[PDB]
Design a protein around this nucleic acid. Structure first.
Ligand SMILES: [Mg+2]
Ligand SMILES: [Mg+2]
Ligand SMILES: [Mg+2]
Ligand SMILES: [Mg+2]
Ligand SMILES: [Mg+2]
Ligand SMILES: [Mg+2]
Ligand SMILES: [Mg+2]
Ligand SMILES: [Mg+2]
Ligand SMILES: [Mg+2]
Ligand SMILES: [Mg+2]
Ligand SMILES: [Mg+2]
Ligand SMILES: [Mg+2]
Ligand SMILES: [Mg+2]
Ligand SMILES: [Mg+2]
Lengths: 184, 103, 110, 50, 142, 142, 66
RNA sequence: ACGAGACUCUGGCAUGCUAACUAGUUACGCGACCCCCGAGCGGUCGGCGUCCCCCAACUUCUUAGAGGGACAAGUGGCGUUCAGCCACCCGAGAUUGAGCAAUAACAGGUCUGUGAUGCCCUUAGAUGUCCGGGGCUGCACGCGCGCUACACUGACUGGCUCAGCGUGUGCCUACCCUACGCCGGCAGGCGCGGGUAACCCGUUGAACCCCAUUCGUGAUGGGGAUCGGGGAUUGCAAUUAUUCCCCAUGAACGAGGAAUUCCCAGUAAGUGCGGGUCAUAAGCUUGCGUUGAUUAAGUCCCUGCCCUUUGUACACAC
RNA sequence: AUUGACGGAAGGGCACCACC
């Protein structure tokens, strides 16, 4: 019984998308007490798919160069965002995170060959893109505003997991699929 | 009878260790309580200069360095016996410093 | 005219040690360490050229290379020619320049 | 003549090989120009290991 | 939680001290008073730092004015003051809202009537503290 | 049995500060309200009773690694100095605050002068710090 | 133009509709009711002291109530 | 055969060897403190000692010597069953980072590194050399390397906890690193001691980070340019502000157009600390640790190199 | 006819001082 931060269970999450089953690592072997470990995940290719998804969300929050290397801060903002999520929704924050990853990932992109022909998206790359979109949505929502990064992260991936269009990641996913459909 | 301390300093390990071996072996042959080679941290003296004599090029640097190794030997014996333990074919790059229980 | 509350004639009477408390920290440090023979000879020449001028005209100009000589209150009224590197610019010492050096009255550029 | 004080500064110190005052290395008590050091380094004992 | 006599704005020293701001940083809007001087003034007086300016009454406002106008009387140290060892008066004091502009003007004209170097560089409108003028300071010039 | 190490230091310091402030025997200098605790601060301490907290903190810092002096005490309480447009550097704390604090503690019979040089903790200082640690550890488990 | 101090209407609103929020924190009470963050922290601490709301977490950067 | 590789230095491993009061650990004894009923093979101690030679042993940590260890060696798969490549087990490690670096060249830079040097110029009203002062820093403007920022993933105040390189008293040569005590608010001052250094600074109590307080989206308690007044230090001399400190003033700047740099793992970036320069001094460089990622394991599209075929009226290379 | 260099030739390969 390994609980994230000591209080969030991990065996009742459900990755409802078969494609992302082996890239969103959250259960049975990937359970951990903290989103912090001496990684060595960028050593070989695909090894970062064996990283816990909360540690990827933590890693992708140390950004813009004034927050580079500050991982303890991102660990506590992830902890506080998870507490805010459990207050607002009423369900396991890991489930909400996993659903936000699944809904916020683009599944058809458009690459520059020339005009931009449409292309399909790898599962690992759409997990990468989902994480990056949620992180930058939270980051740009908390900049020059009285809300804090925990509440912005919480409301960002809550609106993502529910599927509404008031999140930033859903807007970007829709825009990417819209261009990659109008430009097949 | 004193606490005689021999300090050996050199810039190369081979001759220094072989002089230490000679001193320890000679002292063991004449039944001395020899507190053996203590190895002090090697000092690395580093000077990094510009390679060029003028001031033009690709700004490359030259990293010269020189190591200094230090060894200690502690004897507990009269002076005249250490006066024959030492003075047996000291290698050139080695420098000894006897300290006879006082400055 | 007053300088840190005290009038000119009292400034003339007081010694260097009392004068140090009425200066900035730079001039107090410069007077703490001695004045060398160059500045003493400049003071001699300024005194000599002031005590030989007829009444109601300025004293004869005293040229000098010393741009780092602080202006004592026994230098006011006297006329100095300060070198700026090329020429001797004429400076009439007025009582307001007690704190400042002679150097910042002969500009060295254009 | 030699009246000006030369107790500190670049004027006080010169190379012990060429008496040049620029690029002087004073570390460890060398007092040698950078170029003269680069020439006599192997003789002094400064090998280039890395 | 608001008192019915909340002064929305003050007129302490012919200046508008903005209310709704914390008292220690409220009086900072006076020229000549900065954060450290405001804090030492409000500490010498018995004024709670955790107060919005408008919550004070006339008694504390008058006491604040009195302490900041006469700092040496209330044991504020000499090194705190803006104008220590004045060139003309010789008196230690702190120049306030309108006194610091008359004193800055009187200082520049003192250094300019005398034709010192710093005064000339003020008159020409250049940097007076030794800065290199080749590549910086171009905004204020045409 | 509890000792100073077996308790949260951040709450032990508050407990020891409240203890020192309670027993009216600590000597405070007259300039407490007007000084920055180092040349790298910007303002004065926000806490009015900062002296008691600093005295308690250095009493704790003398319980462990005893044998210290004003130099090491100003390297303990030093921090980072922001130099305007220039990069930041480590700068030591003020020596007079540290010396007054250590002398005040010496007057409390808690701290004494070491043999080699510096300052250490008397048996009474050990006893008082250990009893305070016992109190905070007891008040944590309720 | 956030209110530095509560009037009667805003204090009434804070007492009559803030203890029924799922998430209470100084950045959402200071945005629904237009008040400054310092007044928000003061009001929520007063409500916690009176016992109307419950403290979930306490950090130097984020404090969360219910 | 040269170059590549091999080689040398460095990083990672060894409870195996050699040893250590200029490094420690563990036991034992003494001492202080806490609980306690009477408490204890109790807990904390960078408090002391076992260097008067047993009245204690030992080398895990530290140091540095000798060896060992990794080789695509083992197991699958691909491959002409070849060289090799991919994955995995066991492993400290299955690509650590540098140094050196060919044949030929370039009118590349340096005569301002030289008692390296040809020729020319000058050589007493000297282009030698010394002294005094000034200048390299001047200011409508155009570029390049950078530092600080535009804030709430923050600023301020306090508290708590951690480094690694490496330097240190000098032939001429003046100028060292500093503990501790006492004045001062600070920069600083005065005493007094240690260190030619695993001995003293020093258990290098570093910063970011962590924990609590204040602020509240405002050109604001963001930012600290500009400028006024004062105090010290270095120096033979500080003005054209050397540097440092205190109070005060409080500009642009709300994430930056066309373009463009650098980079793939303890890497980028954040963050401090030493060395060089240094009487005074780092927004520079050269090293060092600390927190520590996103993306990628590909390609010849862009920018350049190298090879082959091909045309030449080119050989000082259109 | 050969060796070099060049081609606003034609094929291959390499490099975060090139790109993705
Ligand atoms: Mg925010
Ligand atoms: Mg300009
Ligand atoms: Mg500190
Ligand atoms: Mg040429
Ligand atoms: Mg040459
Ligand atoms: Mg000259
Ligand atoms: Mg120049
Ligand atoms: Mg450059
Ligand atoms: Mg600020
Ligand atoms: Mg401001
Ligand atoms: Mg330096
Ligand atoms: Mg330079
Ligand atoms: Mg390019
Ligand atoms: Mg790119």
């Amino acid at each position: 019984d390994i609980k994230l931060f000591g209080k969030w269970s991990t065996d009742d999450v459900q990755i409802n998308d078969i494609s992302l089953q082996d890239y969103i690592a959250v259960k049975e072997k990937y359970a951990k007490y903290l989103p912090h470990s001496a990684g060595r995940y960028a050593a070989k290719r695909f090894r970062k798919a064996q990283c816990p998804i909360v540690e990827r969300l933590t890693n992708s929050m140390m950004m813009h160069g004034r927050n580079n290397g500050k991982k303890l801060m991102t660990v506590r903002i992830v902890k506080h965002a998870f507490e805010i999520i459990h207050l607002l929704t009423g369900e396991n924050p890991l489930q909400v995170l996993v659903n936000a990853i699944i809904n916020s990932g683009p599944r058809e992109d458009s690459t520059r060959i020339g005009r931009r022909q449409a292309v399909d998206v790898s599962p690992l790359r759409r997990v990468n893109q989902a994480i990056w979109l949620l992180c930058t949505g939270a980051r740009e929502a908390a900049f020059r505003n009285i809300k804090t990064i925990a509440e912005c992260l919480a409301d960002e991936l809550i609106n993502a997991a529910k599927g509404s269009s008031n999140s930033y990641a859903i807007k970007k996913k829709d825009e990417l699929e819209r261009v990659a459909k109008s430009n097949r | 009878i004193h606490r005689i301390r021999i300090t050996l300093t050199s810039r190369n390990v081979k001759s220094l260790e072989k002089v230490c071996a000679d001193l320890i072996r000679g002292a063991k042959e004449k039944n001395l309580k020899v507190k053996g080679p203590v190895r002090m941290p090697t000092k690395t003296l580093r000077i990094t200069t510009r390679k060029t004599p003028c001031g033009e090029g690709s700004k490359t640097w030259d990293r010269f360095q020189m190591r200094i190794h230090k060894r200690l030997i502690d004897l507990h014996s009269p002076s005249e016996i250490v006066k024959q333990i030492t003075s047996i074919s000291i290698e050139p790059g080695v420098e000894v410093e006897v300290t006879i229980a006082d400055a | 005219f007053t300088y840190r509350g005290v009038d000119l004639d009292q400034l003339l009477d007081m010694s260097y040690e009392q004068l140090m408390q009425l200066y900035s920290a730079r001039q107090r440090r410069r007077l703490n360490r001695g004045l060398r023979r160059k500045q003493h000879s400049l003071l001699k020449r300024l005194r000599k050229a002031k005590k030989e001028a007829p009444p109601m005209e300025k004293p004869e100009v005293v040229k000098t290379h010393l741009r780092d000589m602080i202006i004592l209150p026994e230098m006011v009224g006297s006329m100095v020619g300060v070198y700026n590197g090329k020429t001797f610019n004429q400076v009439e010492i007025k009582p307001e320049m007690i704190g400042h050096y002679l150097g910042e009255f002969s500009i060295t550029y254009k | 003549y030699w009246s000006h004080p030369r107790k500190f500064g670049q004027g006080s110190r010169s190379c012990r090989v060429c008496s040049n005052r620029h690029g002087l290395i004073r570390k460890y008590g060398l007092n040698m120009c950078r170029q003269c050091f680069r020439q006599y380094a192997k003789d002094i004992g400064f090998i280039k290991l890395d | 939680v608001i008192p019915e006599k909340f002064q929305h704005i003050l007129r302490v020293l012919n200046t508008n001290i903005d209310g709704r701001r914390k008292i220690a940083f409220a009086i900072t809007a006076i020229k000549g008073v900065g954060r450290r001087y405001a804090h030492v003034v409000l500490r010498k007086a018995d004024i709670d730092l955790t107060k919005r300016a408008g919550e004070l009454t006339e008694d504390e406002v008058e006491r604040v004015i009195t302490i900041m106008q006469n700092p040496r009387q209330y044991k504020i140290p000499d090194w705190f003051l803006n104008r220590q060892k004045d060139v003309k008066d010789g008196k230690y004091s702190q120049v306030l809202a309108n006194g610091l502009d008359n004193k800055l003007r009187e200082d520049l004209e003192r250094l300019k009537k005398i034709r010192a170097h710093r005064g000339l560089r003020h008159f020409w409108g250049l940097r007076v503290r030794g800065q290199h003028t080749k590549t910086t300071g171009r905004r204020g010039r045409t | 049995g509890v000792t100073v190490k077996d308790v949260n230091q951040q709450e032990f310091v508050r407990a020891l500060a409240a203890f020192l402030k309670k027993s009216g025997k600590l000597k405070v200098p007259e300039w407490v309200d007007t000084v920055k605790l180092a040349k790298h601060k910007e303002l004065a301490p926000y806490d009015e009773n900062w002296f008691y907290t600093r005295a308690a903190s250095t009493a704790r810092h003398l319980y462990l690694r005893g044998g210290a002096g004003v130099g090491s005490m100003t390297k303990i309480y030093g921090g980072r100095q922001r130099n305007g447009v220039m990069p930041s550097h480590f700068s030591r704390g003020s020596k007079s605050v540290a010396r007054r604090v250590l002398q005040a503690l010496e007057g409390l019979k808690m701290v004494e002068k070491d043999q080699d040089g510096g300052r250490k903790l008397t048996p009474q200082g050990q006893r008082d710090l250990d009893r305070i640690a016992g109190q905070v550890a007891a008040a944590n488990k309720k | 133009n956030n209110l530095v101090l509560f009037d009667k209407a805003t204090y009434d609103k804070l007492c009559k509709e803030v203890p029924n929020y799922k998430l209470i924190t100084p950045a959402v009470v200071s945005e629904r009711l237009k008040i400054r963050g310092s007044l928000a922290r003061a009001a929520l601490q007063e409500l916690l002291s009176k016992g109307l709301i419950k403290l979930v977490s306490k950090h130097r950067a984020q404090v969360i109530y219910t």
